[PDB]
Amino acid sequence: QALLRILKETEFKKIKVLGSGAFGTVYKGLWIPEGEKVKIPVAIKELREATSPKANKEILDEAYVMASVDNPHVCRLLGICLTSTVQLIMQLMPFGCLLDYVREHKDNIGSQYLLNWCVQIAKGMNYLEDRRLVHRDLAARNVLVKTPQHVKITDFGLAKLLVPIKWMALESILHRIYTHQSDVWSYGVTVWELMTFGSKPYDGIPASEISSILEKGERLPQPPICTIDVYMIMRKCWMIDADSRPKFRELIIEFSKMARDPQRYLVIQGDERMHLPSPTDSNFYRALMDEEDM
Amino acid sequence: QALLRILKETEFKKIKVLGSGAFGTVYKGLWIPEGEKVKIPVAIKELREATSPKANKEILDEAYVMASVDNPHVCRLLGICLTSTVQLIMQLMPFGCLLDYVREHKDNIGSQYLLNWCVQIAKGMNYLEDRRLVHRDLAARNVLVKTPQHVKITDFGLAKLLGAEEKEYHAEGGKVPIKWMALESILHRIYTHQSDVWSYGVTVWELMTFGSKPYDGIPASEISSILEKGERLPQPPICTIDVYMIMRKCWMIDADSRPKFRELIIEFSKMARDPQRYLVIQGDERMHLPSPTDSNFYRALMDEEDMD
Ligand SMILES: OCCCc1nc(-c2ccc(F)cc2)c(-c2ccnc3[nH]c(-c4ccccc4)cc23)[nH]1
Ligand SMILES: OCCCc1nc(-c2ccc(F)cc2)c(-c2ccnc3[nH]c(-c4ccccc4)cc23)[nH]1
Ligand SMILES: [Cl-]
Ligand SMILES: [Cl-]
């Protein structure tokens, strides 16, 4: 209601493109509150095709739901601007998306980070589940890095507004059936994405042939750094019987346990030389760019 | 201890001058975290020459205190660079200081904001008093706008850090804020919470006059004489007598009869609920506070911290 601000083209400007796709283009932007002389960095996602007035109201309705997600591991939609292209505005996450982060910091990301990112991502998903929301498009590309210690799931509602075949539960490929437990399936691909430092899933497989290899019992290979304990949890996220997959509350518990003995569950060369931020460095991050409570 | 990050010149850079005061120059800078790529905007303050140098440890000793202040209405020092100069790092506030803000928005700021800014400043000072700390240099210039709805007191502890004696107690531009100082503080270099309440008085008067220069036309060196003779800042035109009497009580010679910040909070909070009864601003009825939509937006974008 008062969670979504309707903006006007006149009061903000796009500065530089950040990322592309098809559905929308992402820009870094500047918000200029009227009557003021300050320029506030924002993230702007402008969507592909123009919409009629009645489509706009279906979008605006959904925007409100997006604007109500209040959890330190899910991005909240802050605002919206509607013309022929519609623009989504939210806080600017300067570190970008977590897929790219792990690829660029491939080998030199410690085990505490990886397992802690698994906790945060599950905590955010479990929040959506508690509110009976279903994401439909969890993947490493859809997790944003606020600070290296603080990641947020993004793009809730965008997939539900308008195909990521290699992240989808089997039931969703064959029957377009989306649930909380189908979200658990993609969560497991996402973890797999992190543990391989952003390898592409089913590399060497047509997207058209994924449902058959899944029916024949094929799953994504164990990552070299993952112990069997972690790989079994991923493998449990990909079971055919959706209801046998773990629930997010359990994944938070399980990964949290592992985050407490990180070098027992992930084997990374040089892990001992990669430590987690001190109390000092982490107060500094929070005071500067990450003041929200957790 | 861990509240104060110690930086090296390698991991941050000054990119733009934001303004110069008697204690030094503020730059917008960039922190570059180790092994990362991103550039994080920050505020950097390079301090001027400090009278009676206290090595580095005594400096760090005060920096840690400045790093300890944890309140929605006082700026915490985040880190420091000790080298050929002393460089303070804190969170960037793009709106800048409240003295510049009320001037550039003179006659377009309603009573709601003015009275709310005074509540927040007194809450800031009340916290310092509660922590047994004295600011020594409260002024409109030393209040930053985080958002128009949210102000914070800055430069805590820089007066005690740099000190600055000599003729600056007679000049009008130096480290000593004569025209904000309590008479006891001008005469005997005495600083308490109650002299802080004198500067609060003057701070509020700058707010209510939309940025006027206090005792304008009177030389700083002459201030302690006119105060001894009963002269005080005059009633701002938008102030009912209720408000002016609070200002004038802040400026009584007997520090013990001045009000205490905790009372200031309650009295300015009471006036904020009926703001047009206490400030007479023309067009006030058409100057409103922000909507919940607007504040939620500011909060989620720029201002995620606690705050009443
Ligand atoms: O990733 C999902 C689809 C792409 C995307 N869509 C969005 C999105 C934006 C506004 C909104 F209202 C809803 C969704 C983002 C995005 C969001 C916030 N901060 C951000 N920084 C960078 C960033 C920083 C540095 C280098 C490269 C990218 C992106 C982003 N990316
Ligand atoms: O008495 C002097 C008060 C000056 C001051 N000192 C500081 C200060 C900085 C670092 C530190 F460690 C301690 C104090 C600031 C300041 C702080 C944060 N953001 C800021 N933006 C602008 C700003 C923005 C736009 C246009 C003009 C000014 C200032 C500022 N201003
Ligand atoms: Cl896209
Ligand atoms: Cl200064």
Domains identified in chain B and CATH numbers: 1-92 (3.30.200.20), 93-293 (1.10.510.10)
Residue B17: left (phi > 0), alpha (psi -120 to 50), or beta?
beta
In chain B, residues preceding a discontinuity (C to N beyond 2.5 A) are none
> Residue A262 is which amino acid?
P
| Closest-lying ligand 2 atom to the alpha carbon of residue B88 | 12
For residue B166, what are its two tokens? 């000599």
Instruction: Give the CB-side neighbour count of residue A237, counting CA atoms within 13 A.
Output: 25
Break chain A down into helix, strand, coil percent, rounded to 5.
Answer: 45, 15, 40
Q: Are B271 and B243 in contact (CB under 8 A)?
A: yes
3-state class of B86 per DSSP?
strand
Whether residue B246 contacts residue B176, with contact meaning beta carbons closer than 8 Å, is answered with no
Pairing of strands B24-31, B40-47: antiparallel
Q: Is the CB–ligand 2 distance for residue B98 below 6 Å?
A: no
Chain B residues with CB-CB distance to A276 below 8 A: none
**Distance between CA atoms of A120 and B166, rounded to whole angstroms?**
57
Task: Residue window 272-291, chain A: list those with CB within 8 Å of chain B.
Answer: 278-281, 283-284, 287-291
CA A234 to chain centre: 17
The string of DSSP letters for B51-83 reads SS--TTHHHHHHHHHHHH--BTTBPPP-EEEES
Rg over alpha carbons for chain A, rounded to the nearest Å, is 20
Q: What is the DSSP letter of B286?
A: G
Chain A interface, best mutation among B3, B5, B75, by max A CB count within 10 A: B5
Q: Is B300 on the interface with A (CB under 8 A)?
A: yes
B24 has which bridge partners? B47
Give the separation between CA A250 and CA B106, rounded to whole angstroms: 57
The CA distance from B253 to B187, in Å, is 12
Burial zone of B43 (CB within 10 Å; 0-12 exposed, 13-18 middle, 19+ buried): buried
Residue A137 is among the residues annotated as catalytic for this protein:
yes
Partners of residue B81 on adjacent β-strands: B87
Nearest C-alpha neighbor of A43 from the set A117, A177, A125, A145 = A145
Determined by X-ray
B37: DSSP letter: -
Task: Say whether residue A38 is in contact with chain B using an 8 A CB cutoff.
Answer: yes
Ligand 1, residues at Cβ distance < 6 Å: A 18-19, 26, 43-45, 77, 88-90, 92-94, 96-97, 141-142, 144, 154-155
**Residue A76 class from Cβ within 10 Å (0-12 exposed, 13-18 middle, 19+ buried)?**
buried
Cα distance between residue B104 and residue B122, in whole Å: 23
Closest partner CB to B91 (pick from A91, A280, A288): A288
Interface contact flag, A31 B301, Cβ < 8 Å: yes
Strand order in the sheet with A40-47: A5-6, A79-82, A86-90, A40-47, A24-31, A12-19
Cβ atoms of residues B55 and B119 within 8 Å? no
Nearest-by-Cβ selection for B2 from A3, A78, A279: A279
The DSSP letter of residue A164 is: -
Give the list of residues 6+ apart from residue A239 with CB closer than 8 angstroms, or none. A245
By DSSP bridging, strand B5-6 and strand B79-82 are parallel
User: Which among B308, B307, B290 has a CA at the least distance from the CA of B148?
Assistant: B290
With beta carbons less than 8 A apart as the criterion, state whether A128 and A75 touch: no
The phi, psi pair for A29, rounded to 5°, reads -140, 170
In DSSP notation, A42-96 reads: EEEEEESS---HHHHHHHHHHHHHHHT--BTTBPPP-EEEESSSEEEEE---TT-
The whole-angstrom separation of Cα B49 and Cα B166 is 13
Rg of chain B taking only CA atoms, in angstroms: 19
Resolution, expressed in angstroms to one decimal: 2.4
Sheet strands (E) in chain B: 5-6, 12-20, 24-31, 40-47, 79-82, 86-90, 143-147, 150-153
Do the strands A86-90 and A143-147 form a parallel or antiparallel pair, or are they unpaired?
unpaired
Q: Contact, A240 vs A174, CB < 8 A?
A: no
Question: Which is nearest to B149 in space by CA: B103, B112, B122?
Answer: B112
**Cβ–Cβ under 8 Å, residues B56 and B29:** no
Beta bridge partners of A25: A46
Are residues B78 and A104, on separate chains, in Cβ contact within 8 Å?
no
Within 8 A by CB and 6+ apart from B301, the residues are A31, A40, A42, A78, A91
Per-residue burial over B218-243, b if 16 or more Cβ lie within 10 Å, else e, is eebeebeeebeeeebbebbebbeeeb
Cβ neighbours of A200 (radius 10 Å)? 10
Q: Which of B76, B95, B108 sits opposite A287 (nearest CB)?
A: B76
Residues in chain B: 308
